[PDB]
Ligand binder design. Structure first.
Ligand code: HEM
Ligand SMILES: C=C1C[C@@]23CC[C@H]4[C@@](C)(CCC[C@@]4(C)C(=O)O)[C@@H]2CC[C@@H]1C3
Length: 418
């Protein structure tokens, strides 16, 4: 193909991109795309680049943005991205993360468990009704996206109406946030972000009118109290960005977890065990299918960086192929074997041999929602396993095409009565 970004976006590799990634890792581990964007596919390089973000790598400066992203000036989505905390280093990053971190702590995620349980039981009850009638159910549409959408809305300060009203817009924006995005895709993303901006403009007034115990209300109060703690552009970027991160990747992990259950029935037993056993299954789900193969966030080299025979020049945009690092045999031996024991009894995300899964990133931009995602999976997956021992696929799952995300359009299932 033209470059690795073209290969990953190609239909031929949409079903199982990991053979291409194995090819890339083995033949061009420090890949230089046609546009000059680099892509690291080895776990060791990826881990280094993530951990070294702060000095060796930084988010784009104003100069970098104009140089590397000449459209950013006429792209609503790129300009919104430029002011998210994922593009920043301390002290700016510290200030912005400090404003949102409380809502995502272990303690605050615990407070969401009653809602997670109630949504899980409510939706699975309706789903069990249809399945028992012999119906085919699109589990992605009626559960996988529904649970994280509703839980995120409660945390964030959105009504259930708003989040369903924007799911379509959110997914079109997401697809525009990658180098290979077509002019058509980026235009639609820009239009959808103005819509999202329109919604938040209204939501902002509502939460200024009636503050409540949600994230949007605290950001607005922090901004309204003092926009040098959170500027106008930082506020809208934060609202936009957290919405983009708030459920799509979590739903993808629920989808992939269900497929793992069906594909590896001998490993479903892990979901019947104690908390540590359930968590271990979910960590292996996260290693096996990172929902973002690489991250939309650019990392700009602050030095000329020589890696083996390849030199990344100062100022170059470097991306990290998280999904390839997760299946890099140097970090995870026999990497295509699905085995929850890799993460059983260890620190979250850490293998028994001391190698981290990369699906949540690492370093200063380590995923803020990691506990939120893990806990939703930990609550719902054992209930799904116990309720449908005879779940089977009813046709092939339909993936949503994308250059970098691993989401689904459908996960059709039925009950096997035999
Ligand atoms: C399975 C689910 C999820 C996955 C796989 C995932 C993935 C990631 C990745 C790879 C990064 C690092 C990006 C980079 O360093 O270039 C990240 C950061 C982040 N994620 Fe998650 N995410 C998930 C769920 C969530 C949720 C539910 C939220 C809710 C708000 C969220 C919010 C964020 C934020 C705000 C950051 C930026 C943190 C910072 O820059 O300090 N994510 N995520
Ligand atoms: C506030 C924010 C939430 C954030 C988390 C990470 C997430 C994005 C970048 C959207 C695309 C997928 C993913 C996983 C990525 O890193 O590619 C999202 C939007 C902007 C920033 C970073």
């Amino acid at each position: 193909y033209r470059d690795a970004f073209a290969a990953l976006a190609a239909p031929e590799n949409n079903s199982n991109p990991y053979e291409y990634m194995r090819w890339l890792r083995e033949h061009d581990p420090v890949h230089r795309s046609a546009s000059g964007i680099f892509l690291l596919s080895r776990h060791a390089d990826i881990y280094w680049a993530l951990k070294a973000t702060g000095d060796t790598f930084r988010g784009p400066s104003a100069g970098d943005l104009a140089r590397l992203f000449p459209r950013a000036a006429i792209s609503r989505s790129l300009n919104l991205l430029a002011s998210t905390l994922a593009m920043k280093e301390p002290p700016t990053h510290t200030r912005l993360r400090r404003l949102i971190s409380r809502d995502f702590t272990v303690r605050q995620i615990d407070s969401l468990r009653p809602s997670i349980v109630q949504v899980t039981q409510t939706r699975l009850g309706n789903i069990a009704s249809s399945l028992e009638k012999g119906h085919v159910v699109n589990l992605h549409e009626v559960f996988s996206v529904v649970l994280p959408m509703l839980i995120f809305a409660e945390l964030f300060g959105m009504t259930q109406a708003d989040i369903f009203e924007l799911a379509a817009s959110i997914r079109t924006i997401l697809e525009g946030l990658n180098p290979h995005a077509s002019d058509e895709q980026l235009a639609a993303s820009d239009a959808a972000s103005l819509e999202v901006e329109r919604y938040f403009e209204g939501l902002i007034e509502k939460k200024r009118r009636e503050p409540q115990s949600d994230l949007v209300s605290v950001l607005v109060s922090t901004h309204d109290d003092d926009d040098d703690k959170l500027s106008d552009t930082e506020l809208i970027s934060m609202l936009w960005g957290i919405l983009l991160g708030g459920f799509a990747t979590t739903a993808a992990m629920i989808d992939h977890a269900i497929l793992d259950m069906l594909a590896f029935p001998e490993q479903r037993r892990w979901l019947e065990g104690d908390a540590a056993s359930v968590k271990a299954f979910i960590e292996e789900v996260l290693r096996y299918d990172a929902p973002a193969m690489f991250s939309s966030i650019p990392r700009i080299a602050q030095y000329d960086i020589t890696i083996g025979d390849v030199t990344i020049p100062e100022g170059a945009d470097v991306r990290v192929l998280l999904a390839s690092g997760n299946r890099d045999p140097a970090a995870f031996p026999d990497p295509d074997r699905f085995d929850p024991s890799r993460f059983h009894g260890t620190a979250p995300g850490m293998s028994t041999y001391g190698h981290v899964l990369l699906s949540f990133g690492h370093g200063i931009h380590f995923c803020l929602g990691a506990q939120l995602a893990r806990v939703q999976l930990a609550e719902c997956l054992p209930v799904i396993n116990a309720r449908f021992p005879h779940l089977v696929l009813a046709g092939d799952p339909v993936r949503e095409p994308s250059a970098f995300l691993r989401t689904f359009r459908s996960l059709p299932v039925r009950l096997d009565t035999s």
